[PDB]
Design a protein around this ligand. Structure first.
Ligand SMILES: *[C@H](O)[C@H](C[C@@H]1CCNC1=O)NC(=O)[C@H](CC(C)C)NC(=O)OC[C@@H]1CCC(=O)N1C[C@H]1C[C@@H]2CC[C@H]1C2
Ligand SMILES: *[C@H](O)[C@H](C[C@@H]1CCNC1=O)NC(=O)[C@H](CC(C)C)NC(=O)OC[C@@H]1CCC(=O)N1C[C@H]1C[C@@H]2CC[C@H]1C2
Lengths: 306, 305
């Protein structure tokens, strides 16, 4: 029985209309055009033979407004005149002379570990694909990014408001990815320089495992549900010792509990048993715990609860 | 020998000139006035009897511009006219008809666990104290806040640019505090409602313990340094099993290693042994590891960088 769960992204059309190509000298990557501002990764300023130890302060100083070229390729093409430039953290903030007429209602936020967001992968300012990832507890994402993808954007949607949360910056040694929030900070402890970096230990996202067990129950699969319970406080002491994130309940999880009649504490107990082995059985076609679906994913896709 | 380390905050004058009082009905707290915007916690709109599960969307729809009173008390006082209101996550964005003429150069940023920032504690729109804190690994701070302190702001300073990183929201059950970034998200998993909340477990900030051990070496207190080394990788596996954050080196830490000639890996080994007990000895007057001073504190206050 198919769970009815897929990796679902937001429709990308509103964000496609904001993607541009940014070029600074011999370097090029993607930018995001909103109102009179274009955001892009600051390493567009760095000469390719200097990516290991750039002085971004001096690089910024060395630029003028004419150092940047911004092009919209898709839809109505445009070449945007830069009238101002500023650096914020790991991003450039370029001020352009024309406000994007396709600017959607938007906000900037930071995504938290375990939360899901949609990514619009772009090359040379052209959107090429979309996918959705969960921010891992070690502040990487398991994305799909090649050379030239920097400046690809990640976002969520609340109603018609797009919340931009990610600008792609780099690939780590283990093949995962990270980037910047739009306040310019890099997720995690990573730096935007081409050096090998300490990447931290990942964990199972316990709230998302709970959501997936609820998805299994909503599909008629409940062999792992026993009357036994583990309290949140006790589960969280156990989680610290067994590479799980600590569980924090939300209204979204509570809705799944009410709809199924299975208490959160029953699933916390189940996770502790299932972590020691599935005993030859499967849950939603898997023999391992799944933490890439959120409580909101489960509520929206199975129950239609936005 | 006194190390020369103290808890050092930025001078607060530039930020005090941005502080206002925000009142909505019978609720009052502090706000931050930058350009034509006043930021403040959204629970200023919530009646005191409804704080345990506010419908903030409905509260916001029910307000008008006239629901808010904004006053600047210190310096050149003013009662500001509110001409727009909006909500961004856990913060209200009030638009006022006058741009703050004392608006400093500023950015908004999020502070990371282990990093230090300065807090201007305010009551009724009036600055009353300043102190510095480190963001804990569980996204709380060990602050000093009483009723009426919400909207107090935390910040760092890079040159003449103020980087606002914190707006105060709540006290947790264990006496620590948390707040919002200026994107309106709460630090950590906390929600701005008056209910019991899961508090995640705190950890030692390994990078700051390393800085403090370098401060001891710079002060001549080096009895804990041995030839033995622990690699960053092996230390980080041990840290996961011992309530420490994983270590990530920075240029600030490297500067301390070059100055003392003691390798980071020698101090990682030391931390592992010291954590089991100081064997009756002291380091910089302490019998336990200290993680409230950053590599940058040590570079500035001891090496004068
Ligand atoms: C920007 O488009 C690009 C995205 C990555 C390219 C491959 N997949 C991506 O997600 N970002 C970068 O190339 C980074 C630039 C830095 C931040 C200034 N660097 C980066 O991701 O580095 C990855 C690894 C780390 C070790 C290393 O030498 N290296 C760089 C290789 C990988 C890419 C091909 C040749 C260079 C870039
Ligand atoms: C705003 O000025 C104020 C600041 C705090 C007042 C005391 N010191 C502060 O730092 N913030 C609030 O009053 C919060 C409003 C919420 C966000 C809507 N509430 C708050 O901080 O509540 C604190 C109390 C006392 C200590 C504590 O753990 N706690 C929360 C309650 C809720 C659960 C029941 C008992 C505890 C846990």
């Amino acid at each position: 029985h198919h769970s009815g769960l897929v990796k679902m992204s937001h429709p990308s059309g509103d964000v496609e209309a904001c993607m541009v190509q940014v070029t600074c000298g011999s370097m090029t990557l993607n930018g995001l055009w909103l109102d009179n501002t274009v955001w892009c990764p600051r390493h567009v300023m760095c000469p390719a033979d200097q990516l290991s130890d750039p002085n971004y302060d001096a690089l910024l100083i060395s630029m003028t407004n004419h150092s940047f070229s911004v092009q919209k390729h898709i839809g109505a093409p445009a070449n945007l005149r830069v009238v101002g430039h500023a650096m914020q953290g790991t991003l450039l903030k370029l001020t352009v002379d024309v406000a994007n007429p396709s600017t959607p209602a938007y906000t900037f936020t930071t995504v938290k570990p375990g939360a899901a967001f949609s990514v619009l992968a772009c090359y040379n300012g052209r959107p090429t694909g979309t996918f959705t990832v969960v921010m891992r507890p070690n502040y990487t994402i398991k994305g799909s990014f090649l050379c030239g993808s920097c400046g690809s954007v990640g976002y969520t949607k609340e109603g018609s408001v797009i919340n931009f949360c990610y600008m792609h910056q780099m690939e780590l040694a283990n093949g995962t990815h990270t980037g910047s929030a739009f306040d310019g900070t890099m997720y995690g402890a990573f730096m935007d320089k081409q050096v090998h970096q300490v990447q931290l230990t990942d964990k199972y996202c316990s709230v998302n495992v709970v959501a997936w067990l609820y998805a299994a129950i909503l599909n008629g699969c409940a062999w792992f549900v026993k009357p036994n319970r583990t309290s949140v406080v006790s589960f969280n002491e156990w989680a610290l010792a067994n590479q799980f994130t600590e569980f924090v309940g939300t209204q979204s999880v509570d809705m799944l509990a009410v709809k199924t009649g299975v208490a959160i504490e029953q699933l916390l107990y189940a996770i502790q048993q299932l972590y020691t082995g599935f005993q030859g059985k499967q849950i939603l076609g898997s023999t391992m715990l799944e933490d890439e679906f959120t409580p909101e994913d489960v509520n929206m896709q199975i129950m239609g609860v936005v």
